[PDB]
Amino acid sequence: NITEEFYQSTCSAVSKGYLSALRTGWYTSVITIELSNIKENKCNGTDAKVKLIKQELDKYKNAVTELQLLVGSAIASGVAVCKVLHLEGEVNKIKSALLSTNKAVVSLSNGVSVLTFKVLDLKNYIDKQLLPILNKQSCSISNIETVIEFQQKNNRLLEITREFSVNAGVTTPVSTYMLTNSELLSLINDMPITNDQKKLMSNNVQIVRQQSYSIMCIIKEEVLAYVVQLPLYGVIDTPCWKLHTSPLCTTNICLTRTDRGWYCDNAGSVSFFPQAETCKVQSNRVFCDTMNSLTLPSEVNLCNVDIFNPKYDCKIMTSKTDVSSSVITSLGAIVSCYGKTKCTASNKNRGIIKTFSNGCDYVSNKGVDTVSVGNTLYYVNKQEGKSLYVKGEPIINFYDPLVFPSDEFDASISQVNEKINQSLAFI
Amino acid sequence: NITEEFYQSTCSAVSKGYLSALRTGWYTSVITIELSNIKENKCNGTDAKVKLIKQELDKYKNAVTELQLLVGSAIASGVAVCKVLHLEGEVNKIKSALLSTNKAVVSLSNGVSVLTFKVLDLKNYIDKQLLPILNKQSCSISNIETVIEFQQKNNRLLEITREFSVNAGVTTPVSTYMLTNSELLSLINDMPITNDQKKLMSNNVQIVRQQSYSIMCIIKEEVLAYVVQLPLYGVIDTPCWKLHTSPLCTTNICLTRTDRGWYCDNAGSVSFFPQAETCKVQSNRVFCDTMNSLTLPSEVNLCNVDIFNPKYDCKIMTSKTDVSSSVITSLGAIVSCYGKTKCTASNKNRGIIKTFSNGCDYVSNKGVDTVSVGNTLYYVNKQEGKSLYVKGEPIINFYDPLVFPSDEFDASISQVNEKINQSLAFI
Amino acid sequence: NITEEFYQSTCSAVSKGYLSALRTGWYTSVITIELSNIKENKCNGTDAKVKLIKQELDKYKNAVTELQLLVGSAIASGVAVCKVLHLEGEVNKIKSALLSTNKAVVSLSNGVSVLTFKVLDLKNYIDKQLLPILNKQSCSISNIETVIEFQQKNNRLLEITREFSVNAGVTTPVSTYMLTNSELLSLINDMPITNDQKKLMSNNVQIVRQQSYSIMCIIKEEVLAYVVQLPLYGVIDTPCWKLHTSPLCTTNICLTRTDRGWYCDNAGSVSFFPQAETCKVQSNRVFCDTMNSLTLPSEVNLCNVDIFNPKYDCKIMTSKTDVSSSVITSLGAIVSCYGKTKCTASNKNRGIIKTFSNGCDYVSNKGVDTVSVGNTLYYVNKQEGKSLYVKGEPIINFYDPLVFPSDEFDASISQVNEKINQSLAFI
Amino acid sequence: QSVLTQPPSVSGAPGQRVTISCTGSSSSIGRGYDVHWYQQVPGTAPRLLIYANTNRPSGIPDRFSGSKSATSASLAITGLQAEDEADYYCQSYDSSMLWVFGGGTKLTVL
Amino acid sequence: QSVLTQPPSVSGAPGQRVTISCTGSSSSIGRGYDVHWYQQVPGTAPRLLIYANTNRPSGIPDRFSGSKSATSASLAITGLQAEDEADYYCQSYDSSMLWVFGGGTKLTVL
Amino acid sequence: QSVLTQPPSVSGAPGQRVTISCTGSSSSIGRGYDVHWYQQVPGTAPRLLIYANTNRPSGIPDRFSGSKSATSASLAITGLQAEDEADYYCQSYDSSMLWVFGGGTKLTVL
Amino acid sequence: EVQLVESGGGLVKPGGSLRLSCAASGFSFSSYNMNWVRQAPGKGLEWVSSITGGSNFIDYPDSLKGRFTISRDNSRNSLYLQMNSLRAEDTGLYYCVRESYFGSGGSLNWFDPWGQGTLVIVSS
Amino acid sequence: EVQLVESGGGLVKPGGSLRLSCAASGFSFSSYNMNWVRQAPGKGLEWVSSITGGSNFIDYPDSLKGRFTISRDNSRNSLYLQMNSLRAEDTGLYYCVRESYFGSGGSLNWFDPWGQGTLVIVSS
Amino acid sequence: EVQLVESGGGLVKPGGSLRLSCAASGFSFSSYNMNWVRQAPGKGLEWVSSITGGSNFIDYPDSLKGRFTISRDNSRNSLYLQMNSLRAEDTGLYYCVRESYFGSGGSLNWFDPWGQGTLVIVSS
To answer: Is residue F100 part of a domain?
Structure first.
């Protein structure tokens, strides 16, 4: 279950109980489509069915012509494996590898082993069910069903070409055109990873797609091969907690904790994700990626329970920005109401049930459903869980608004204290 | 009409005459699709038409299997109503509600009333026009038109499944696949709101889609129901004005007003939107949302006409960043040209018509069409309107670049003045 | 080829050898689709083929009804040309110009000459191959091929309508539906530009789409015309270099160069792009746009070779943020390792090959393939090139951590030095 | 004939709670528009009593209460006094008639 | 034979304005490329006079002007003097011939 | 019967390098899972020797090395001493058997 | 200090034309909506006319549609209602009432500041 | 200072039930995975049971599936393995071994801190 | 101070080969394009060759295609034109002219700094 606590000492909420799934590695698979080489239709006539076939084959030719025209780095592995594929004598190895069945494990020149799927079989249909069936003497097809089937088998290449032209070679997330669900699940169940990671990643294909990349690789020698870059979750089932902060001001000077975001346990340290877009929450997991993360010693947990600890000084922002605002955390809401603005929390049926005063306050989602600040209306999350409210005395009251350095952006607690001491010693 | 003014005292432009449309509330509607449960095709044969039917029905089965695998919060209301739907005894109420007609108003367990529309009737076609028509004795369909019609009725579910798989359960904007225009307009014309808001939002369905969310809710019991989260415009037809700022420097020290963005009247206060992506302008309206807004007292208007007012101190940024730049506001352009860079304003046919000097200057769109700064080329908006140019003296000339605190980010006018006074008293 | 250098004096890498392609101008073309006006089908019957035709024509009518419902500015030129089109007597000129062939050059009221292409010929098919072929006496069509052809010719308008409804009138990138590759290439080969720019922009249609805008213009008088806003590259083949910076700290105070991003030569000055998403790299070119660029004197190059130069002071950020991090530049990687965190560089087959010490260090991509910092795993680019490592002494060690102003965000070298001098004079 | 229905008159004794009902159709209270309760003492302009169907404006004693459920709204007065005798009007919207207003409930103290 | 056409010679008196025309086809001045007007005094390298079809480089007297319209461009000299006698060349582009240049207008003072 | 195959015993003299092989199938070393080399001196709990198939934990002498290629892994000991006599186990994964572990190589000094 | 004072009412013969004015003070008039509501003597209330802040969303009920024209002048904070072709009804008090939002979205908000009313009598 | 001490082993008749406990100290238990591995006397090693940090990813091999139940209690840093229906095998040393990541992604990571082991004997 | 000084012209028999060099100083050569333009004695101008900054966009007119080879060496700011198989034409002045952008997009920009010209004569 998910449990939330609210420290009034620093006006900050912590939501714990989450589990982890960290994108730590990249795996590169090579998806190959077997195309066919055709010059032109020998026969010509006024039949409309052959006109439809000619139009469809011309669209296929245009599609195959289009594909011949194509901090950290998120696509470095795919670029490396594409450079490997461009090496001579490598495409033929793949093409001769998965000839009897559409699943192979191949070793390239660089020594890296990759999985190969033959996801489409367009060559067989074009060269064995269109050219021989089409009788060039009469230039007519008896059944329109053949044309309808061609339109039902050539769509996938057209959609792949369209997506690659729109996104300019690299696309994300991988769509159902580029990788069907059955194939994605099969590749997941055959990827070189533990059975623990294969049971968390089969049930969450909704997010594997969002965190995957796909890069156009090769069209040469009647084989359209592109690299799909799946993630490998190297950290699974470790506790994580989200930290939300709100402005805290006197009734002025404002001190806001400036380390909002996700924290996850990782090999004895804490992986810190400041960006909210980085992480995603399905039920109680965080599907974050370490590419947008920092590494911190395992004492940042002490910041949440003691703002004045001596082992790891926290980070704050000091400013005279006296503006009311609210943060809709999970299982509740934090409101900071100052000035003449009216702030309230309203139930769905009992209307206004609170008359928020000046300062920082917190309301659980048990009962409270909407929060009005000024006129802005926020809806609180309705996730079931237990909330705890620890009372205290706001930190900003301990300081004095006479030598307060209301100019910093984010230094630390210790830096603010030493600046205050220097200012006091100056007088 | 739209009227622009340019204050040279602070080098800032105001564009007034706009009207308002604020997204203040969320409304949740339940869109339901009646699917059908089928195990497999009893008959089997070498006929190609039955092969097409089998492929289409298999794609339908894969699509229905896919859907079984699925500050403030923008999707809190949708999540709450989905939690309500997941409660036992609720899906049956919806299914038995819109049984005679595809439009109903239902009351759920939580007491919130929602609109339900049956947008698709795939169950009737599958269970009453495919199984009985398909004669299992011969396993053949006389007319290919039935297959073509099936392909023309099963596309919508495939596209919905594809969008939900790509976007991982929550999608925006609501595309035409997930909600047709006629359906969206009917839902708008039946939503629980005043006729005033139903006349502004019927003509602007182009932006309601962009500001709406859609979430997968339930697949249980042969009913695919998902929640569409439409916006409710609680503030309509109030005056709004846009404020643009440009760097202002000596000929050095630079003071830039740091409150760019939209302002709207709201219940006697001013709703301030700093983000430019937050608001959209169709003709003369601003389709903003209050989730990304601040509330200010109704004295921020005095900042635009008197930078040194005593009732609401403005916000500035002080820095020695001496870089030339231009701001393409509506109805004109602001150009701040510094150093050796060459800045000009050019007509389409009369070429260069101005030779901008050092400092901040403003050119209306009457005549002036392009603006060159250095080599960067900007195109000014050609919206018809009246421009006014009020002369004055730059504020930075009043200050002295000897005790200037060129380190702040955004404190205020008053804070800068008191820091200057403290520095003067120190000497 | 691409050459990388790493200055340890400021812990910054420069990647040179790139070429330029700057989006300096906008060109507006008018793409017109000739629609047809039809009231209703006179005949009615129980035939299924006529039902399919009626459904398709009704979808066409709904699509045509939908389109009747529709710093710097990136769409100013397109808005101006649309305002020109709305003027009376202009649409007829376009319609009568491209009457004999689907390619014309027209002069509008404002005097600007634009290219017009008729990309679709739906009117001829609807009014000359559907109404006369459909015999209203029997209300039946002999061949289903006509319906299949209609479904293969009406998809374009449906997709254009869908994209315009989703994106609310303005779309980017221009997808294959709205502009096919052959049409885009013909428009490129007939646009009013030099043959030098027509040979760089034909081979890079993958990026012209991403940097182009398309806006709905007019539906009036049975002509659906929309403006495609292509870019005009006014700067081609000038040297460019990318500058990457990493935190530099003592073993504390941290001094980071704060001018990351692209630099390009431009008419004797330097165009500076701070945003990384602004520029794109295909092979060795940078497809940037000047709208997100600054202009600097041609002495910013001296910042890279002498941090303490007297002609153009650099920009630095001073802070006590002692956090380890890495930057994956092209052809190598920069790693700044501080505190107790473990930082290593690992080969694919030889495993860990380095044991990075505290401070800033750099590893080429020759051999080094992965970089581990804490637990975060980064993959280095595998682009072939020459790396050079110039030794020196860190600049931060020259300062003293006693009067260090660890509060600024980005002032300059000169401002930091003068603040240090003022602090020294105070004592 | 009004869109909404209200009792013609209700009565009570001092210190007794009285409930006033406001019933409407689907294109009415239903679909959840709202109900607003207005007071009118004769010879005086109408005054807002309850808005958003449950809340209360400042300057109104807390003894008043309002609620809604399904298709019916209720206004409850606790501790009746001589000053509360008046005309009470219930208000909502209508998709085909716009603002409706009630028929007027005459509340008097016995 | 040149892609663009130009009068072989124009004449005038001191203090009199003279107009020089530059006419071209569709794959020419049309589609709106530009005109550039170049001056050549015999025995001296050619010098830029008008660029971007209307503007003027620094160091050129303001009495010169240039314009374009439809498919024809004009260069106008106001207040003719003895120093303006020279060869004047109009320039544009061609999709099938590239940089074209004019046939040369010999302007002399009477 | 183990999933992987290992030599029953290898021998050597002091100062001599010895190579121990670890061979497996496709659903094995193949597909590139990894190999890990564990040491066991009798009467003592097993100790990690080589992880990630090439690296080395702190506190292990540099004379040890590990590598893999195609479908076979190798562990090389350079400069054999009396303290290295032990049971050596090679480890990898299996899609149908999970953690496999080796059959045990008994290395002794002559 | 929201003051809504309205006047212009007087005796008019049936079939005549009349104009009623309403002045508002003490609040930002340009952002709040306005309405005109009737109250016949001894009868219930009945909404009559609506207008929004920007003067471009007019609204009337079905019964009185096309006869009553409402126009607000934002310059001097004024509201005007023009009645043509009077009938036996429409007699009674007319209230110029400010439609005031900020009670959340909530559709119909809460019209607070009713004016004292203008008495309009139609008879021969 | 990673200490893994395991206990609870003793003589049990064939077909009996047994429980083995493992206490871990000196490291953050809640993030590292755990495993139980066998070693028969004089025979090779053989993996037996796995569990992850969140106690919701259980794993057994095919041969011992459905008999051995593993459960980690995170409150006092404890691991437990319950053995039902013993057979002639399973005799030997049992090691409670911490599965420790941070050797890159690398699937199978590097189980470092093997405990001294508990001796379990089955016989009559 | 843009100086374009070019030389290498001299008398050559018909059908011979020739080379012309052009040195540029006072400006950043690597960013500006280069062109070679002819002027026959007593005749109009005629563009001859073009090259861009990166040396990978060559351009010639149709008449002189395949005969004149242009090449700019960026190291010491030099431009070279190699003439093969001379004919009765090509005699006259050759100008090494810097194609200079910054006149907006504007396609053809504004070639400013024309050199003094080199006299190349072909005859027997």
So the answer is: yes
CB of A107 within 8 Å of a chain F CB? The answer is: yes
User: What Cα–Cα distance (Å) separates residue F109 from each residue in A137, C55, G65?
Assistant: 83, 87, 110
Q: Is residue F3 part of a domain?
A: no
H102/C377 Cβ within 8 A: no
Question: Are A34 and A166 found together in one domain?
Answer: yes
Number of domains in chain E: 1
> What number of other Cβ atoms are within 10 A of residue B388's Cβ?
11
Say if CB A85 and CB A108 are below 8 A apart.
Answer: yes
Q: State the Cα–Cα distance between residues H29 and H23, nearest whole angstrom.
A: 10
Number of domains in chain A: 2
Domain housing C268: 3-21+238-426
Bridge partner residues of C376 (DSSP) = C373
State how far the Cα of E28 lies from the Cα of E95, in Å rounded to an integer: 7
Q: In chain C, which residues have their Cβ closer than 8 Å to the Cβ of E70?
A: 107
Residue F108 C-alpha, separation from nearest chain A C-alpha, in angstroms: 34
F93 contacts chain A (CB < 8 A):
yes
Classify residue A275: in a domain, yes or no: no
Beta bridge partners of A118: A32
Question: For residue C101, what are the contacts with CB-CB under 8 A and spacing of at least 6?
Answer: none
Spell out which residues of chain H touch residue F48, defining contact as CB-CB under 8 Å. Answer: 110-112
Alpha-carbon gap, residue F18 to B366, rounded angstroms? 88
**CA dihedral for C18, C23, C24, C29, sign (positive or negative):** positive
Quote the CA–CA distance of D37 and D75 in Å, as a whole number.
8
Burial degree of I3 (CB within 10 A; 0-12, 13-18, 19+): exposed
Residues 2..31 of A with a Cβ closer than 8 Å to H: which?
19, 24-25
Which letter does DSSP use for residue B221 in this model? S
Number of domains in chain H: 1
User: Is the Cβ–Cβ distance between A406 and B411 less than 8 Å?
Assistant: yes
Nearest-angstrom CA–CA distance, A337 and C342: 44
Domain boundary among B187, B216, B235: B235
Number of C-alpha atoms within 13 angstroms, CB side, residue A20? 31
A52 and A6, same domain (yes or no): no
Residue/partner pairs of I47-54 with CB below 8 Å, 24 or more apart:
I47/E98, I47/E99, I47/E100, I47/E101, I48/I81, I48/I94, I49/I81, I50/C196, I50/E98, I50/E99, I50/I99, I51/I79, I52/C196, I52/C236, I52/C237, I53/C19, I53/C236, I53/C237, I53/C238, I53/C239, I54/C19, I54/C236, I54/C237, I54/C238
CB contact under 8 A, B349 and E67: yes
> The domain that contains D83 carries what CATH number?
2.60.40.10
In a domain, D2, yes or no: no
Q: Domain limits at E58?
A: 9-109
* CATH number of the domain that residue I71 is part of: 2.60.40.10
Residue D101 lies in a domain: yes
